[PDB]
Amino acid sequence: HHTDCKFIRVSGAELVQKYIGEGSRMVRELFVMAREHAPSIIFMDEIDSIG
Amino acid sequence: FDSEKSGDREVQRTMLELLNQLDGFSSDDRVKVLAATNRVDVLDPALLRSGRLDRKIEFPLPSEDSRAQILQ
Amino acid sequence: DKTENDIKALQSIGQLIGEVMKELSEEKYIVKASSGPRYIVGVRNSVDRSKLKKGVRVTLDITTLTIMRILPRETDPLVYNMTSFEQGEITFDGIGGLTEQIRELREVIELPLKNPEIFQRVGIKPPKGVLLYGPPGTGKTLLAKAVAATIGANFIFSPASGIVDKYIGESARIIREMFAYAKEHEPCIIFMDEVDAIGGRRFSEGTSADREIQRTLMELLTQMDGFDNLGQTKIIMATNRPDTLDPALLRPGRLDRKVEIP
Amino acid sequence: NVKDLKASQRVCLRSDSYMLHKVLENKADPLVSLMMVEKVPDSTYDMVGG
Amino acid sequence: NALVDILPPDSDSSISVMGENEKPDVTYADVGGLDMQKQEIREAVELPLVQADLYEQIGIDPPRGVLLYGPPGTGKTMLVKAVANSTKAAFIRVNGSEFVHKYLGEGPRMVRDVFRLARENAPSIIFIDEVDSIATKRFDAQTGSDREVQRILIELLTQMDGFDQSTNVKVIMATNRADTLDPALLRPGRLDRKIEFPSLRDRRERRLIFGTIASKMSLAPEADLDSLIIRNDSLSGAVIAAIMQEAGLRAVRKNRYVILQSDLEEAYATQVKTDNTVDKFDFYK
Amino acid sequence: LRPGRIDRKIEFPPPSVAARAEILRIHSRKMNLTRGINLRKVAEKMNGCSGADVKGVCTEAGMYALRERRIHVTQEDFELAVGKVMNKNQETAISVAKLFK
Ligand SMILES: Nc1ncnc2c1ncn2[C@@H]1O[C@H](COP(=O)(O)OP(=O)(O)OP(=O)(O)O)[C@@H](O)[C@H]1O
Ligand SMILES: Nc1ncnc2c1ncn2[C@@H]1O[C@H](COP(=O)(O)OP(=O)(O)OP(=O)(O)O)[C@@H](O)[C@H]1O
Numbered sequence: 001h002h003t004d005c006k007f008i009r010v011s012g013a014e015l016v017q018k019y020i021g022e023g024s025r026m027v028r029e030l031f032v033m034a035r036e037h038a039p040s041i042i043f044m045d046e047i048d049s050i051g
Numbered sequence: 052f053d054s055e056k057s058g059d060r061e062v063q064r065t066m067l068e069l070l071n072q073l074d075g076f077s078s079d080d081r082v083k084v085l086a087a088t089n090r091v092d093v094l095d096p097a098l099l100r101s102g103r104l105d106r107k108i109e110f111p112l113p114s115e116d117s118r119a120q121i122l123q
Numbered sequence: 124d125k126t127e128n129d130i131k132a133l134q135s136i137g138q139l140i141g142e143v144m145k146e147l148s149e150e151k152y153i154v155k156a157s158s159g160p161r162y163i164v165g166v167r168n169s170v171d172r173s174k175l176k177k178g179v180r181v182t183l184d185i186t187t188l189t190i191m192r193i194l195p196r197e198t199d200p201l202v203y204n205m206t207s208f209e210q211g212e213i214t215f216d217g218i219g220g221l222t223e224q225i226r227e228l229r230e231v232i233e234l235p236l237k238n239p240e241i242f243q244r245v246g247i248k249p250p251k252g253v254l255l256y257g258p259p260g261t262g263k264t265l266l267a268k269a270v271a272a273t274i275g276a277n278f279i280f281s282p283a284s285g286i287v288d289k290y291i292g293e294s295a296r297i298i299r300e301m302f303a304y305a306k307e308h309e310p311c312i313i314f315m316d317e318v319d320a321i322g323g324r325r326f327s328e329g330t331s332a333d334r335e336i337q338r339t340l341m342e343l344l345t346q347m348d349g350f351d352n353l354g355q356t357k358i359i360m361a362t363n364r365p366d367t368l369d370p371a372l373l374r375p376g377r378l379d380r381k382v383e384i385p
Numbered sequence: 386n387v388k389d390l391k392a393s394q395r396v397c398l399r400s401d402s403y404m405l406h407k408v409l410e411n412k413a414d415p416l417v418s419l420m421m422v423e424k425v426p427d428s429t430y431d432m433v434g435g
Numbered sequence: 436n437a438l439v440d441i442l443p444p445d446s447d448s449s450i451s452v453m454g455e456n457e458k459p460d461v462t463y464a465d466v467g468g469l470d471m472q473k474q475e476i477r478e479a480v481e482l483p484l485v486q487a488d489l490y491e492q493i494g495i496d497p498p499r500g501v502l503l504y505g506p507p508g509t510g511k512t513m514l515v516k517a518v519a520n521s522t523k524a525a526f527i528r529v530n531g532s533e534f535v536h537k538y539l540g541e542g543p544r545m546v547r548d549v550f551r552l553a554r555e556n557a558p559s560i561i562f563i564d565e566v567d568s569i570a571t572k573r574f575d576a577q578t579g580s581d582r583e584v585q586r587i588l589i590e591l592l593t594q595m596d597g598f599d600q601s602t603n604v605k606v607i608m609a610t611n612r613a614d615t616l617d618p619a620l621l622r623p624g625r626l627d628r629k630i631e632f633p634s635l636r637d638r639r640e641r642r643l644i645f646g647t648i649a650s651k652m653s654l655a656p657e658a659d660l661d662s663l664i665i666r667n668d669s670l671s672g673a674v675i676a677a678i679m680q681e682a683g684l685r686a687v688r689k690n691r692y693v694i695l696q697s698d699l700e701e702a703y704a705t706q707v708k709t710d711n712t713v714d715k716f717d718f719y720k
Numbered sequence: 721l722r723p724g725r726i727d728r729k730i731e732f733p734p735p736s737v738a739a740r741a742e743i744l745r746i747h748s749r750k751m752n753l754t755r756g757i758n759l760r761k762v763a764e765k766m767n768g769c770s771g772a773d774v775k776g777v778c779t780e781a782g783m784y785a786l787r788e789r790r791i792h793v794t795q796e797d798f799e800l801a802v803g804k805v806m807n808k809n810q811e812t813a814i815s816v817a818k819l820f821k
């Protein structure tokens with residue numbers, strides 16, 4: 001909030017999307033959106049509970 | 052027809068509809084089925100039973116004499 | 124006259140069916156159409172306010188959209204195909220040696236159906252639902268047909284996969300209207316034939332097809348239990364391997380007896 | 386005109402045959418979709434402090 | 436194609452109320468044990484209906500959504516009926532199979548109706564029977580229909596943030612599983628309270644559940660409800676709703692209108708099923 | 721974990737006892753307290769290893785205070801909350817034994 005970044009909390013989810021719908025193809029694109037709306041913080045929270 | 056966590060649960064829903072039309076509400080009394088299969092190890096237990104496939108024809112390995120007929 | 128009747132139909136036009144979704148005002152009604160999108164529509168003085176209630180089908184015009192008359196309910200084209208199965212009949216003793224299994228079967232089924240009045244004495248909850256399980260060939264479907272004939276009540280006889288459709292959401296609609304129909308028709312007895320993969324587990328790591336399974340499965344339990352409860356009207360669940368089903372179908376109370384046919 | 390128009394900009398139409406009228410005063414960012422459905426408000430160091 | 440009139444919230448319902456035009460059918464007396472969880476369901480439902488402001492004056496964060504989880508049969512849904520009967524507020528019985536996609540725009544429109552109705556004639560309870568067919572831990576999201584189910588759940592998230600700061604009771608939902616749940620639904624601010632329901636419970640909480648279904652039915656002077664408490668120790672609530680129901684069927688083979696212990700132990704033997712917690716497979720004492 | 725892409729490692733340890741007292745205070749800034757409650761005294765009753773445990777002690781104190789229906793959160797509710805949350809530590813998964821090999 002101080003730095004004025006977009007706080008993008010990812011969580012290892014397929015529910016946050018509904019427009020591409022898999023995480024693999026949303027690595028380039030997530031970067032490109034965070035560059036549109038830069039500055040940004042991509043908080044990719046991995047969990048590793050998945051499977 | 053016990054499958055978990057895969058899309059063979061889509062596959063069996065076209066198997067059960069066939070077994071529905073081989074249950075007797077007739078319409079399988081002159082309407083018949085031939086079936087060829089190459090593997091007889093994985094056939095459904097609801098097709099082992101008679102009322103579905105009734106007559107069970109084995110196809111052998113040809114005998115001595117039979118091979119000569121086939122060639123000819 | 125055979126052609127005069129055709130003239131009179133021809134110079135008329137069709138009607139388009141709705142049902143009263145919600146009353147708004149005296150002359151304005153909200154309907155949800157059988158084709159879909161909701162409208163606000165009017166009324167003639169050919170219908171009364173005391174003659175309309177909700178879920179009652181109404182006519183509309185396709186040129187002004189106004190109700191002229193009350194319309195009876197609708198019921199699937201699909202469920203009429205199930206009432207046309209009745210063949211495969213057998214006598215009341217039609218399973219040799221499993222006659223004992225008939226006795227167990229009627230205690231849930233035939234006796235409270237005919238007289239709920241003796242079970243008031245007992246003081247227990249209204250009997251509902253049974254599972255037949257056993258290896259193929261033991262006349263689980265035959266026992267289904269035999270309790271259909273002998274009781275002689277309204278009967279279906281649902282294929283597992285003639286209540287599935289391409290669209291995921293029409294598959295839910297059919298059985299919703301199938302339980303409604305069973306309540307319109309005293310002693311309607313419902314054989315689900317070969318449930319395995321339409322009442323199966325949560326699965327959902329395979330195809331998208333597996334989400335239609337759930338969707339349909341919830342439907343069954345909500346009819347059976349909620350602010351709808353069935354004591355007139357009986358469930359026979361025929362399955363070909365016992366442990367194929369969701370645990371909610373392994374929870375007796377919808378399915379009170381799990382009868383083994385040896 | 387074409388120099389007031391750029392990609393990913395929402396517009397309003399008066400359908401005289403789909404005649405572009407004005408820009409729309411609303412857009413929903415596609416990055417904001419992810420963030421919405423997550424749903425996060427802002428924090429500072431009194432939520433960490435100590 | 437212009438806006439010619441406006442419509443009240445009340446009208447244009449998905450379905451009309453069931454809680455000030457009907458009355459829930461199951462009372463809190465038909466719930467036996469889970470007394471620890473009963474202190475919690477009157478915290479979760481009853482106190483935000485009579486007055487939300489009690490929380491405000493303390494300054495403690497409210498509970499928002501109610502999550503019921505457990506293996507099925509443990510009376511999650513029965514309990515919803517229960518506290519709605521005691522509080523005597525509005526209740527709306529909808530399901531997610533009345534929300535499911537059928538037309539374009541069906542999904543969002545149908546989610547919105549129920550919240551509008553609840554808020555206008557608040558304080559209200561919204562019940563969604565289950566959310567296991569909408570909310571699934573995983574989605575393929577490579578087909579149009581899987582993104583429709585997702586549109587329906589996403590609206591539900593949006594309406595849930597909307598529902599907050601209101602004297603309504605935030606949506607009730609139950610789940611039969613642990614892998615129906617996503618890490619964006621159980622977030623606090625969406626589902627705050629997670630009321631447990633085990634298949635474990637202790638000897639006291641098994642004990643009350645037998646006695647209530649015996650209160651419903653006739654009994655004999657030789658009927659024992661308390662000889663069943665220790666036979667099995669992994670029970671759910673409605674597996675007892677079957678054993679008792681079956682005792683009234685075995686009795687009718689006799690032509691009896693009281694329940695015998697012969698009837699009740701013969702029904703005990705079935706519906707339990709394979710269990711390894713019971714005292715015969717136990718030699719670790 | 722390839723060497724050179726990790727130039728900062730932020731380990732959050734289990735709370736200190738100066739830190740653990742302030743977590744109790746953070747939550748209490750929305751709440752009403754009966755004057756004289758030290759959440760440092762409660763912190764010496766706690767031993768902890770996560771600041772999740774102390775968030776549950778505050779939630780419990782205001783729900784005990786809700787049960788009473790008093791505006792203030794009273795001081796015995798913070799006594800009861802620590803023992804209630806510790807029972808809850810033995811029921812989410814055991815972790816404090818001292819019983820080791
Ligand atoms: N238990 C039985 N006793 C007497 N006849 C039987 C029995 N089971 C099957 N039959 C005979 O077999 C015919 C067909 O069997 P049916 O279609 O009833 O098989 P099923 O194994 O019950 O079906 P499913 O495999 O779908 O459960 C019946 O019409 C009847 O003549
Ligand atoms: N523990 C119980 N004791 C007595 N009756 C019960 C019990 N649980 C459920 N019932 C009765 O069983 C019927 C259905 O209950 P309900 O559908 O609420 O249960 P549920 O466990 O929430 O179901 P599900 O497995 O679908 O989640 C009702 O008639 C109800 O009164």
Ligand SMILES: [Mg+2]
Binds near residue numbers: 070074264
């Ligand atoms: Mg059959």
Ligand SMILES: [Mg+2]
Binds near residue numbers: 511609611
């Ligand atoms: Mg449920």
